[PDB]
């Protein structure tokens, strides 16, 4: 899906940006801030701010490019799906935005879709 790929492309563009608690871009990000930025930049409105809410909003996803992957219920971490088993995410303070295999989180996960 083209909107999904667009959200992914915006997330990828942020690879290398520093983590900051409270960051939603363009230069500094937390996990949910990267999700929010990536959607807003593509005109995909309606996305909430914090991870636990992003995990509950929208519709069920499949893990396709641009879906939101969330970790936990209630969720404490999120990323943007690449569509291949990996995600773009802002990991934690002291890391930069990067791609990680979703399996490497070693915890429960699901998918939402906002586009």
Residue numbers in the entry: 23 to 137
What does the paper say about this structure?
We have recently shown that T. vaginalis has acquired NlpC/P60 genes from bacteria, expanding them to a repertoire of nine TvNlpC genes in two distinct clans, and that TvNlpCs of clan A are active against bacterial peptidoglycan. NlpC/P60-containing enzymes typically hydrolyse the stem peptides of bacterial peptidoglycan (PG). We characterized the 3D structure of TvNlpC_B3 alone and with the inhibitor E64 bound, probing the active site of these enzymes for the first time.
